[PDB]
Symmetry: D3
Subunit: 154 residues, 6 copies
């Protein structure tokens, strides 16, 4: 609906390790979405446990957390119309085996446990994830010079 | 698509030109094996755009569609090849970029249907109409690709 | 129980070589995380092409296929990784380019099914057969990717 | 010395070998990405008399007839690009006229080998650009528009 | 000399506006340099005036600072052997008219006042710029899986 | 510059180039320029072959370490054919030490350390002939004619 919808996109440690920071940003940049926040971080274990709190009672929870601590993460907020859903489409199917070539995982990933990136799955979860990963002042307010060539209305 | 000399009309809309997408869009058709047989940068008169959109003259959005397409230059092209009409639309992606797949032009570069960066003829008959409308007959260039027999089974 | 050491046979056909597509096709598999184990430029003898296409020997226009595949060099490759046979086919795209999707090799580069730029094995068992047909065993290079553990969670 | 006027224009042509080898998109992208503005473009198979006029300075050379004949042998993507110093910087983007002397990263240093198959042409001076633009294009084929990012490409007008 | 030399690379507001974040990051990433800090920032005028302290007495100073306030900046620390000098080579000549195609400015820029990016000009100026633009905890310690294939050791 | 369009050179992608996923990009640089691939294989050659490859450097203190390093992974061995391909090939690779190389070349885009400089290219027409014959069996050189030869070359 509105062109100021926001989503959280993270490049996971394997994405950073395999040199995919540049290509992943370009996918979102070229599509017309606006980068409003970005930082390279090695977040503390508590933040990762809170991020994955829905999986806390799962037997893989401990190893998943320790894996996400194993290298830096490129955390980002992207803004645009339907950016949450279209963002997931750009990333491709969560399991790369189900993903389509032309998407990030369909071009770059194989294992679901090494699926290079994450994107919020809903507007509500995006708001939660943005608040968990960013301070409010880390979101930069700006307007793209080509806004009116990307969008027909607000 | 039966005959390898089928032709379609592809236009890069004002937003495609403004956002610097001329090169990338041409490369998509070039790399696929289609042959560019006509091209010009043009800002056509309102009467021509109204005739282009003649099948929509009885739609409420008709005037704003015409007025938007007057708001910047258009890269008008004729591409030739087997099934180029239908395959060309597949290359452009779904008319509404929200329904398009990454790896297509609109799936890589566009968000709003009113800013969907390009147009392609929707049928062989409409292609011939659009080609006759946008190009004089002598602007279609007759030539044979050096790799014709490697693109097409003889 | 798909193991990360599965192998498939990918070949760039004479039209792919002629049209300058060796680099981009290799990049598609390289970027995905699959490991190149074997590769060679080759113009194989007619008898090897006929054995490669054994399933088509009693179908029409068999001679025409073999002649066309003799008409230029082929870039023969072995790629290794988890589910590489099935995923490799998805990367190539639908065998008939008219049915393929942009973002695949054929959806980006090809038009005619008879000039569809590349080949990939259609099954694990046929890949093993094709790998043994096109490569001597010493031509398969055993190595370990520096990013193996960033591509794979398990073996 | 570089030009200082943002409305300078140059004539860029993709030659029949550049069209034949599938380099239209890549070549346009080099100028597009640099920030130059496309103000005219057409695919054209010009008459022999126009090519002879384009190469008028070489009319007495022994290779003239074969050069003209070669430039007739396939389509040409004719362009006018506009921007600050676009004549001289455009030639820098094309690379040395002889590709053997060109640098990788330029069009000829990425795509060409023989000077007689050097994929493209660019005007060699501001005055020759003005002449070439008028030779290859009708005046109404130059398109007036304003790039949305003009003020992020240029500090001054 | 040392493979842990660091330099400050900034994508200026024009580079952000023109959609060049991805390509610029890719140039450094593909070369083998390691990203150790990155943030998108709209830094305060005080920080920009410090960054340009040496030009404070120039006529263009006020407009220069105002321009660098006009859009976000992608601020980065890159690490690797000779990354300061080699980083400047990757960016191209500071004036894009003097830059070579194949560099960032030679591929994407025309005006020196709209030259898309900045890179430290010396190791000592890099240490100064990193301290000014980054907090120390924003620099992340990690080791590339391909370190031993980029570097002999 | 050479003037014979059938000149050949030996180009190798070193173990670090293979490890870092640069096979595709490096081949494309030569492919896009108009050079013709006439031989290619992935190989892990024996020490004796590498010592013969580097015979002109066998009096240098880095010789044994250079040989050992070239055994540390697979090598993509290639022969490319075209006018001035030896000298223009080296120009495409960039300066041997990437510190001195220019962006837009292979080493200027992808490499930092001279000991991890991604690739090798023959330094002379004669050394190309020797290297080609050292790395390939005679029958691994493939005879074919590029469909765009007459659009890459004006004559000869």
């Amino acid at each position: 609906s509105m062109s100021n919808e926001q989503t959280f996109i993270a490049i996971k440690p394997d994405g950073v390790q395999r040199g995919l920071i540049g290509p992943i940003i370009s996918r979102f940049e070229n599509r017309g979405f606006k980068l409003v926040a970005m930082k390279l971080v090695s977040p503390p274990q508590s933040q990762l446990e809170q991020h994955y709190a829905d999986l806390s009672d799962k037997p893989f929870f401990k190893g998943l957390v320790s894996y996400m601590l194993s290298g830096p993460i490129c955390a980002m907020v992207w803004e645009g119309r339907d950016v949450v859903k279209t963002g997931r489409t750009i990333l491709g199917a969560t399991n790369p085996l189900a993903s389509a070539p032309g998407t990030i995982r369909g071009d770059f990933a194989i294992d679901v446990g090494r699926n290079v990136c994450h994107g919020s799955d809903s507007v509500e979860n995006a708001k939660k994830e943005i608040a968990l990963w960013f301070k409010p002042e880390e979101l930069i307010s700006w307007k793209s010079a080509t806004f009116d060539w990307v969008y027909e209305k607000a």
